[PDB]
Design a protein around this ligand. Structure first.
Ligand SMILES: COC(=O)[C@H]1[C@@H](O)[C@@]2(O)c3c(OC)cc(O[C@@H]4O[C@@H]([C@H](O)CO)CO[C@H]4OC)cc3O[C@@]2(c2ccc(OC)cc2)[C@@H]1c1ccccc1
Ligand SMILES: Nc1ncnc2c1ncn2[C@@H]1O[C@H](COP(=O)(O)OP(=O)(O)NP(=O)(O)O)[C@@H](O)[C@H]1O
Ligand SMILES: [Mg+2]
Length: 373
RNA sequence: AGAGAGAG
């Protein structure tokens, strides 16, 4: 445990970028994981939502970069285009002063423009989503020759059944000596088993499941009775609220579109976000929510992981998540870096089992919503 | 399953 960025043997010009970004003291995960990452160990880093995992790996990557080698030295993957873009902006701002280059390799962007930029000069760090990154590797416009660090953010999503093969196909193009770093708020037992295909006696920084939920996010439930409409329950509640910014999670794209329309039909101002929209529209919606121009986003799990909007203080689970790990991530959209937030769960009878599994596994208190608001 | 995840 190192409690000061000055105590981490970081180059002075990386420190200029850290302090310019506004950080003053390292968070708990930063105090524990930056040094092992810099030293080149494989690291599994679990830590509570919103406590600074991004800068943990960005700082470690930037300290390792050989700036005058104009070649890609580090590859970071994320499960969604929005998260990859967010991560890219953090690395680029931390690395700006020292002159590290960081390029986003994500789907839905002009390929010719990207290929020309890569042809101009290989960026030091690539942050991307797996499909586009593997495409660029396969076309040979991205070279793995000097990649010595491979970071999976949201690692347990990236190593799930639907992604692990994409990750493994990219991993095949990397040198055997590549350092591997995995970070997530959740690290379930099945994923930790999978990590042996990727990693060599790694350092494990884990959180006890009964201590994972954030103290500052008050969790509540509302029972929806059999004859009641969940839509009325949300609208009645939504009226009695003064929102700064809020996220409402829905399990399907179809239902996001439907709910957005219903809410507009009751003169509520919301915007919708999901993965079947054009990337230009996704970018606009995200930008307007980050800036505070729209106050309430209705979304799928596209935005459950990693997305950081400080002003979000309210999460509503209109549908409960289909796996318990996404519960942690969804409610973690509020309460970023020690702010107090609220999460509200709508619970129909068929939802009780799901919510019960969440409560007992994480040993967390979910209380009946009071009238205080 | 859902949700994500290249190009054309
Ligand atoms: C089991 O096979 C796979 O894992 C493959 C396929 O799944 C794959 O083709 C694949 C998709 O299939 C429907 C969809 C996909 O995203 C969706 O659809 C995109 C397009 O619309 C659909 O093509 C648009 O964006 C996404 O919606 C927004 C990415 C993707 O990448 C793949 C791929 C295949 C070849 C390739 O270079 C030759 C690059 C990517 C997977 C892959 C394989 C290795 C490494 C990473 C990813
Ligand atoms: N040392 C720090 N001091 C102050 N703010 C910080 C520090 N590190 C990170 N932050 C901010 O805390 C917020 C959360 O950081 P982020 O890296 O997104 O968290 P995370 O641990 O990855 N959360 P998640 O992916 O949802 O599990 C961002 O606004 C960061 O700028
Ligand atoms: Mg994160």
């Amino acid at each position: 445990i190192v409690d000061s960025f000055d105590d981490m043997n970081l180059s002075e010009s990386l420190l200029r970028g850290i302090y310019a970004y506004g950080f003053e003291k390292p968070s708990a995960i930063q105090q524990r994981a930056i040094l092992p990452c810099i030293k080149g160990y494989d690291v599994i880093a679990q830590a509570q939502s919103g406590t600074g995992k991004t800068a943990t790996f960005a700082i470690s990557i930037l300290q390792q970069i050989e700036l005058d080698l104009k070649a890609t030295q580090a590859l970071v993957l994320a499960p969604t285009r929005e998260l990859a873009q967010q991560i890219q902006k953090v690395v680029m701002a931390l690395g700006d002063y020292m002159g590290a280059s960081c390029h986003a390799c994500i789907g839905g962007t002009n390929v010719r423009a990207e290929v020309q930029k890569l042809q101009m000069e290989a960026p030091h760090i690539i942050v991307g989503t797996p499909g586009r990154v593997f495409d660029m590797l396969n076309r040979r416009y991205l070279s793995p020759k000097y990649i010595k660090m491979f970071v999976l953010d949201e690692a347990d999503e990236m190593l799930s059944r639907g992604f692990k093969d994409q990750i493994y196909d990219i991993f095949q193009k990397l040198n055997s000596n590549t350092q591997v770093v995995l970070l997530s708020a959740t690290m379930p037992s099945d994923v930790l088993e999978v990590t042996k295909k990727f990693m060599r006696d790694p350092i494990r920084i884990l959180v006890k499941k009964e201590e994972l939920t954030l103290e500052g996010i008050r969790q509540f439930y509302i029972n929806v009775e059999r004859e009641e409409w969940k839509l009325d329950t949300l609208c009645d509640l939504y009226e009695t609220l003064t929102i700064t910014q809020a996220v409402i999670f829905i399990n399907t794209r179809r239902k996001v579109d439907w709910l957005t329309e219903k809410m507009h039909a009751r003169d509520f101002t919301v915007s919708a976000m999901h993965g079947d929209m054009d990337q230009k529209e996704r970018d606009v919606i995200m930008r307007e929510f980050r800036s505070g121009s729209s106050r309430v986003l209705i979304t799928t799990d596209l935005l459950a992981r990693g997305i950081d909007v400080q002003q979000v203080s309210l999460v509503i689970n209109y549908d409960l998540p289909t796996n318990r790990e996404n519960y942690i991530h969804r409610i973690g959209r509020g309460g970023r870096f020690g702010r107090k937030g609220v999460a509200i769960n709508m619970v129909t009878e068929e939802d009780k089992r799901t919510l019960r599994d969440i409560e007992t596994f994480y040993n967390t208190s979910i209380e009946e919503m009071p009238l205080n608001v």
